Amino acid sequence: FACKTANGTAIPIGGGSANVYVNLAPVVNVGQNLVVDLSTQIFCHNDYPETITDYVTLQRGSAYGGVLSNFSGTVKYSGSSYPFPTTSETPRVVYNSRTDKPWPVALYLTPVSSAGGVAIKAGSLIAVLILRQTNNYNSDDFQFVWNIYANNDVVVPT
Numbered sequence: 835f836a837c838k839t840a841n842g843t844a845i846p847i848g849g850g851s852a853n854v855y856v857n858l859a860p861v862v863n864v865g866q867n868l869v870v871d872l873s874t875q876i877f878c879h880n881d882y883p884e885t886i887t888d889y890v891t892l893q894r895g896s897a898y899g900g901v902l903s904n905f906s907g908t909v910k911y912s913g914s915s916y917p918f919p920t921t922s923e924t925p926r927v928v929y930n931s932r933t934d935k936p937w938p939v940a941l942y943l944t945p946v947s948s949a950g951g952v953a954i955k956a957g958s959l960i961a962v963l964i965l966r967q968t969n970n971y972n973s974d975d976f977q978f979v980w981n982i983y984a985n986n987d988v989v990v991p992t
């Protein structure tokens with residue numbers, strides 16, 4: 835089991851960490867949702883699907899920078915909503931193919947009432963998403979750490 839980003843950064847067998855730079859809606863109003871869809875940026879595959887089945891959870895979702903300070907939101911994992919920050923390991927997603935399959939994570943953030951101006955600064959850390967991978971074959975327990983960075987400013991009009 836290994837994962838790669840749309841840009842090309844790979845985390846090999848055994849886990850690791852990588853940086854993901856995401857484009858963001860450049861304007862968001864109070865009452866609107868800023869969507870961070872990582873299912874288009876992070877992909878994974880099962881290296882030995884003929885005999886092994888890999889299981890993948892969202893172990894932890896942390897908020898940073900302007901997202902931590904100016905936003906409140908949820909995380910959508912494999913079609914279901916969970917609190918963000920995610921404080922407990924989610925249910926499992928099955929990876930049973932060698933062809934790359936997206937990691938179905940997406941953040942839905944809304945600006946807080948007091949937000950205004952540059953709510954997210956370009957190049958800043960906004961989130962860390964930890965992908966925990968196991969299997970039905972041995973005791974493998976690997977963490978794929980995804981550091982989510984904003985490519986551009988996100989402004990809240992005032």
Ligand SMILES: CO[C@H]1O[C@H](CO)[C@@H](O)[C@H](O)[C@@H]1O[C@H]1O[C@H](CO)[C@@H](O)[C@H](O)[C@@H]1O
Pocket residue numbers: 835836847848879880881882883886887888968969971974
């Ligand atoms: C075939 O190589 C994989 O399987 C053997 C055991 O059959 C492992 O010892 C080896 O490290 C490889 O495991 C990788 O791929 C597995 C299936 O994707 C995954 O379950 C492992 O955690 C590891 O990534």
